[PDB]
Design a protein around this motif. Structure first.
Motif, PDB file in Angstrom:
ATOM      1  N   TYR C  42      -5.708  -1.490  -6.756  1.00 20.67           N
ATOM      2  CA  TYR C  42      -4.424  -0.898  -7.092  1.00 20.67           C
ATOM      3  C   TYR C  42      -4.296   0.501  -6.544  1.00 20.67           C
ATOM      4  CZ  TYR C  42      -4.844  -4.767 -10.223  1.00 20.67           C
ATOM      5  OH  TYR C  42      -5.048  -6.015 -10.749  1.00 20.67           O
ATOM      6  N   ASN C  44      -2.395   0.948  -4.037  1.00 23.12           N
ATOM      7  CA  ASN C  44      -1.001   0.833  -3.681  1.00 23.12           C
ATOM      8  C   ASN C  44      -0.342  -0.062  -4.726  1.00 23.12           C
ATOM      9  OD1 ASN C  44      -1.861   2.316  -1.483  1.00 23.12           O
ATOM     10  ND2 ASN C  44      -0.848   1.031   0.035  1.00 23.12           N
ATOM     11  N   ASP C  45       0.945   0.143  -4.997  1.00 22.28           N
ATOM     12  CA  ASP C  45       1.754   1.214  -4.443  1.00 22.28           C
ATOM     13  C   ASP C  45       1.828   2.424  -5.338  1.00 22.28           C
ATOM     14  OD1 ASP C  45       3.004  -0.325  -6.281  1.00 22.28           O
ATOM     15  OD2 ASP C  45       4.900  -0.552  -5.193  1.00 22.28           O
ATOM     16  N   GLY C  47       1.169   5.516  -4.490  1.00 23.11           N
ATOM     17  CA  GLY C  47       1.009   6.349  -3.314  1.00 23.11           C
ATOM     18  C   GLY C  47      -0.257   6.135  -2.523  1.00 23.11           C
ATOM     19  N   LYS C  49      -1.766   6.774   0.382  1.00 28.09           N
ATOM     20  CA  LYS C  49      -2.094   6.432   1.742  1.00 28.09           C
ATOM     21  C   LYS C  49      -3.209   7.341   2.224  1.00 28.09           C
ATOM     22  CE  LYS C  49       1.334   9.655   3.194  1.00 28.09           C
ATOM     23  NZ  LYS C  49       1.859  10.218   4.463  1.00 28.09           N
TER      24      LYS C  49
ATOM     25  N   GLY D  15       3.368   5.476 -10.872  1.00 30.73           N
ATOM     26  CA  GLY D  15       2.604   4.508 -10.117  1.00 30.73           C
ATOM     27  C   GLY D  15       1.756   3.592 -10.965  1.00 30.73           C
ATOM     28  N   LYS D  18       4.031   1.367 -11.952  1.00 28.94           N
ATOM     29  CA  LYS D  18       4.382   0.454 -10.872  1.00 28.94           C
ATOM     30  C   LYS D  18       3.270  -0.545 -10.603  1.00 28.94           C
ATOM     31  CE  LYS D  18       7.688  -0.302  -7.787  1.00 28.94           C
ATOM     32  NZ  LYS D  18       9.054  -0.815  -8.122  1.00 28.94           N
ATOM     33  N   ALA D  19       2.038  -0.057 -10.445  1.00 27.15           N
ATOM     34  CA  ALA D  19       0.943  -0.925 -10.027  1.00 27.15           C
ATOM     35  C   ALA D  19       0.491  -1.871 -11.131  1.00 27.15           C
ATOM     36  CB  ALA D  19      -0.235  -0.091  -9.538  1.00 27.15           C
ATOM     37  N   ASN D  22       3.664  -5.038 -10.826  1.00 31.13           N
ATOM     38  CA  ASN D  22       3.543  -6.106  -9.846  1.00 31.13           C
ATOM     39  C   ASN D  22       2.309  -6.968 -10.053  1.00 31.13           C
ATOM     40  OD1 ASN D  22       1.920  -3.992  -9.277  1.00 31.13           O
ATOM     41  ND2 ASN D  22       2.658  -3.653  -7.187  1.00 31.13           N
ATOM     42  N   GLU D  38      11.707  -3.116  -6.450  1.00 28.25           N
ATOM     43  CA  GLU D  38      12.061  -1.711  -6.345  1.00 28.25           C
ATOM     44  C   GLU D  38      12.421  -1.190  -7.726  1.00 28.25           C
ATOM     45  OE1 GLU D  38      13.297   2.043  -5.703  1.00 28.25           O
ATOM     46  OE2 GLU D  38      14.953   0.696  -6.196  1.00 28.25           O
ATOM     47  N   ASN D 165      -0.255  -0.156  10.034  1.00 30.38           N
ATOM     48  CA  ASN D 165       0.045   0.237   8.667  1.00 30.38           C
ATOM     49  C   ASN D 165       1.508   0.014   8.312  1.00 30.38           C
ATOM     50  OD1 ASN D 165      -2.668   1.306   8.797  1.00 30.38           O
ATOM     51  ND2 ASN D 165      -1.749   3.002   9.925  1.00 30.38           N
ATOM     52  N   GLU D 169       1.931  -7.505   7.607  1.00 30.12           N
ATOM     53  CA  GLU D 169       2.040  -7.567   6.158  1.00 30.12           C
ATOM     54  C   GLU D 169       1.020  -8.563   5.643  1.00 30.12           C
ATOM     55  OE1 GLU D 169       5.923  -8.039   4.736  1.00 30.12           O
ATOM     56  OE2 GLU D 169       5.352  -8.392   2.650  1.00 30.12           O
TER      57      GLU D 169
END
Lengths: 102, 132, 52, 227, 74
Positions: C42, C44-45, C47, C49, D15, D18-19, D22, D38, D165, D169
């Motif tokens: 995890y 991503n996402d 941030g 990078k 995040g 977010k993480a 998903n 999104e 990058n 995908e």
RNA sequence: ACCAGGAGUGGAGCCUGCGGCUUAAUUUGACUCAACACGGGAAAACUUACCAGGUCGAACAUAAGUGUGUAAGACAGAUUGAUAGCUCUUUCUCGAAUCUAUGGGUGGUGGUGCAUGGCCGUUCUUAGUUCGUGGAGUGAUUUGUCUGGUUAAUUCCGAUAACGAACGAGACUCAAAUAUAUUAAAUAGAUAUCUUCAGGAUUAUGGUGCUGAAGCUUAUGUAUAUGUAAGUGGAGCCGUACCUGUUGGUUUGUCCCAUUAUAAGGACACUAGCUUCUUAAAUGGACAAAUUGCGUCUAGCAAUAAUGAGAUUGAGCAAUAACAGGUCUGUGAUGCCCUUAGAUGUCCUGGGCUGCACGCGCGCUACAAUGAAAGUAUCAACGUGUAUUUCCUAGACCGAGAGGUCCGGGUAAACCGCUGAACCACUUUCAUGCUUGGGAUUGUGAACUGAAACUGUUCACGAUGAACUUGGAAUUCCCAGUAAGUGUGAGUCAUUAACUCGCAUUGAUUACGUCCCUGCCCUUUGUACACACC
């Protein structure tokens, strides 16, 4: 009597920070909100570094993780009934607006 | 003061409050190792009050001389316990009360043009001392 | 009430791994509590990078 | 609610929100071909823009499954009943987005190692969806105890540079089988320049497309009227 | 500011040198700008060259920038 | 990989890591490069998997009490480590989930990484792979994917035996140098003047100057300072400007106003503080016909040209085929195996993972005059910092210290913080003498953090001064802000770096090569080599 409303803008994409000075300040200095230009903030870069292998058996390499957060500041000298339309439009993904009332 | 370098300019002023009766000597001036690094005591008290020359540029450029911002960053060049050398905080003690030795807040009421300028009048005389 | 000792608000136990509940490999303090091997999955996402 | 929290703790708080999301967006909505979410933030509400493929099974009878979204995360994240808004959208070109294609191959393995029946047909489907390059890879125990890999490839996969990058995908998938497990991993390569390309990035990786030299009438005889 | 008890004072060599040129470039005279360069540039000790030589970042697997530590019974 | 070195360890003490020892257990994974301050593995409990004591229970159809109490809880004395009514001598009790022997699912840090997924590691610092279409062969397979020149290069000319190929390489993404020429500041400020913080007499002195100025004490009042006289003393006194300094606003400057006060509205300088600056958000950016007795007309080094720029320059990125590499102990990744009211599961109290005749590796301070002390001077940068958790700490104050008290700042360009880092610079004490080098070593108290500190949680003092005097054979590392010296931040973190990642400072020597060395890349050739010279 007259109010001064400083409105900070934070996000991650510098292009979205280039997208918020694309249309917010141009739809405000037609009515002269006294933006005082795009006030750049220094970025808050975030470094994390970790090992790669779970159960770290062999060739102890590492893996560096970076993060870039950027702001740009728009201060305004206007009462609160002026800035209400600007809070509605324009909106942007990933960008944050911080105006306090009380 | 922003005259010639404060090697000897500290050295003269240490004598003068020692001259003028305003010593205000700590009763353990022969005890303390002036911080958690020294194996021996200092040679004498003649540093202990002398950092008024340091604050005359630090009230000028750093801050009103709070003692916590004072003792931390100056007088730390230390080798502590053998695994390995590190930094210190120097833990002053009695020169918290050296404001009494001078007789949002300000730290000196005589180091504006009153008694600092005497040291300037000493160094203006020290221009004449160094005239030969 | 009974037979549950350990006043856990001191030490590592038990402020442990609010992303996987796995103790001995924890990234505790960035406001993450991520169990750094699970942070591999995890990354991503959230941030993060890599750049350099 | 609101906090005096730091900005760097604020930004990572999105995040971990977010993480986590998903993850279980693939636990439930794997049956409907979930692809992505999104989440934006506007004043006085937030929005959740889910994209999936079986967009008539995400809604359910009498609007039950949409409230099932809203009853979940407001029970999960304890935030405002009304400031959370969830909308499911249709994945454009489900074959081209292909991570739902990675999800559906787990529904393809039960045809008894249906490589030529199903799994190689995915690599046919990715050109039936009309992509540029593609690569799938399955590893595990096949026809015996031993682990072994296949890599059915088609096209051009860059693996390097910055646009790797961006362009390619990947989406790994696991699945339980009676043997034990077959790892599924897919690498696709998509023509991000030409077709409509509303908001991808409109890229240009390496190509040198040359404009014609545009021959001239060098003489340019006057032939000028005086209107 | 910055630098150190050697390096920060070396930047002052660039400080005095360029000020005389710019005051002579615009205000005083072209040849006045010329007569302060020619006597300087014979060797000049790079009094105007700002070399960008700064420090080089580390690598994991070492103590320092490029060195490392080894012989795990190789 | 050497070489020319430089610094090293291997010697010394100490921290660890691994073993062996032992033990109730000293839980364990990992053993050439590619195991070894590793598993982020800096453990008092927790972790914890191990060891002792304990302890908990978990599903159903059946079923048999019926609800004449099937239960479940405490006192009390036993059992305890704690009240575990866990058990119980005797007591009342919310009673029903009918508390079942029976389905069998449930957990698992239990087993197999030689059944697996995943990731990661090395093979390989590389430059290397493949495909259709041809001719080569019965075929394995070659050709394309090469002779040479050159390249960091399967990078390119060029023989050009498909190519237009395709992956790799490159290209690309990220970092101070770069015109602020444009807009950009509650960072910094440049400035400017307003100032205020004012010495010099450097200034001009007006009044003054031997007439008692300046300076000085005594008295008490006021709550000791101050007032004055006397005391006192014999030239200066006092004001300004110039010179050198605080400060505040100098945001569309001043004066306006509305306003409690900013702005314009009213004019002036018409700029009575602007953007150098840090910050970008941009495009600039050795942007290379850069000339050079032309190398196979093409990739003739030359240092020469620039004068922010002789790459500003390191990272990330990484193909095909693979290994019985490593990980079932990161996971609700998992086959299978094992177990389950009597647990390997689980929570508790302990213990241990730290124990030792010994071996081995990463690494710390040394072994001293370039030094150990005292002093003074006085330069960083990466960062980080508290609203469901004890952070950053400003200030006062107290305390040998350790710390402690009281009161703030700060969710952070704004406060800690202009973090005014260290080594080094400057006078001294030392007078090479296991010394004052070196601080292991053991007592003692004082402390901190926390329920709890005991081959110790760490920390203070005054003792205690051992080994150690440059370390054998062997042996590691690296070419410019680099090596090394030298700090600091972060990472884990109730407290614990002595390690790992990043940061800056001080700043060298030596090579600018070659294939002896260990090397490594499909060129040719040899074979009796399978699991391929172990």
């Amino acid at each position: 009597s007259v109010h001064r409303i400083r409105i900070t803008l934070t996000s991650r994409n510098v292009r979205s920070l280039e997208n918020v000075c694309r249309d917010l300040i141009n739809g405000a200095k037609n009515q002269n909100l006294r933006v005082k230009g795009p006030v750049r903030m220094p970025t808050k870069t975030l470094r994390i570094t970790t090992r790669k292998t779970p159960c770290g058996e062999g060739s102890k390499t590492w893996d560096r993780f970076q993060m870039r957060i950027h702001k740009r500041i728009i201060d305004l000298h206007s009462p609160s009934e002026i800035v209400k339309k600007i809070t509605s439009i324009n909106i942007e993904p990933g960008v944050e607006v911080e105006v306090t009332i009380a | 003061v922003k005259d010639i370098d404060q090697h000897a300019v500290t050295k003269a002023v240490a004598v003068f409050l020692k001259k003028t009766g305003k010593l205000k000597v700590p009763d353990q001036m022969d005890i303390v190792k002036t911080a958690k690094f020294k194996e021996l005591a200092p040679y004498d008290p003649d540093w202990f009050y002398v950092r008024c020359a340091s604050i005359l540029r630090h009230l000028y450029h750093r801050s009103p001389a709070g003692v916590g911002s004072i003792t931390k960053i100056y007088g730390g060049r230390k080798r502590n316990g053998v695994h390995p050398s590190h930094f210190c905080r120097a833990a002053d003690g009695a020169a918290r009360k050296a404001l009494q030795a001078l007789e949002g807040r300000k730290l000196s009421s005589i180091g504006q043009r009153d008694l600092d300028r005497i040291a300037n009048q000493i160094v203006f005389k020290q221009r004449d001392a160094a005239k030969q | 009430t009974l037979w549950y000792s350990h006043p856990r608000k001191y030490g590592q136990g038990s402020r442990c791994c609010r992303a996987c509940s796995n103790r001995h490999g924890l990234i505790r303090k960035y406001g993450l509590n991520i169990c750094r091997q699970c942070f591999r999955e995890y990354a991503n996402d959230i941030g993060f990078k890599k750049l350099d | 609610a609101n906090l005096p929290i730091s900005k760097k703790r604020k930004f990572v708080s999105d995040g971990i929100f977010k993480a986590e999301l998903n993850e279980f967006l693939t636990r439930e909505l794997a049956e409907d071909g979930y692809s992505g979410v999104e989440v934006r933030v506007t004043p006085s509400r937030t929005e959740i823009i889910i994209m999936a493929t079986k967009t008539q099974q995400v809604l359910g009878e009498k609007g039950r499954r949409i409230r099932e979204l809203t009853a979940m995360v407001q029970k999960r994240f304890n935030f405002e009943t009304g400031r959370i808004e969830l909308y499911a959208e249709k994945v454009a070109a489900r074959g081209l987005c292909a991570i739902a294609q990675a999800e559906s191959l787990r529904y393809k393995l039960t045809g008894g190692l249906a490589v030529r029946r199903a799994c190689y047909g995915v690599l046919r489907y990715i050109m039936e969806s009309g992509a540029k390059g593609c690569e799938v890879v399955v590893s595990g125990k096949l026809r015996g105890q031993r682990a072994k890999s296949m890599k059915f490839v088609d096209g051009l996969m860059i693996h390097s540079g910055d646009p790797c990058n961006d362009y390619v995908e990947t989406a790994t998938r696991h699945v339980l089988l009676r043997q034990g497990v077959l790892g599924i991993k897919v690498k696709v390569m998509l023509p991000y320049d030409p077709k409509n390309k509303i908001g991808p990035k409109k890229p240009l990786p390496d190509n040198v497309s040359v404009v014609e030299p545009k021959e001239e009438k060098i003489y340019e005889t006057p032939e000028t009227e005086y209107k | 500011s910055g630098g150190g008890h050697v390096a920060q004072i070396y930047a002052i060599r660039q400080a005095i040198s360029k000020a005389l040129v710019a005051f002579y470039q615009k205000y005083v005279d072209e040849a006045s700008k010329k007569e302060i360069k020619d006597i300087l540039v014979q060797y000049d000790r790079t009094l105007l060259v700002g070399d960008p030589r700064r420090c080089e970042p580390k690598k994991f697997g070492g103590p320092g920038a490029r060195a490392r530590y080894q012989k795990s019974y190789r």
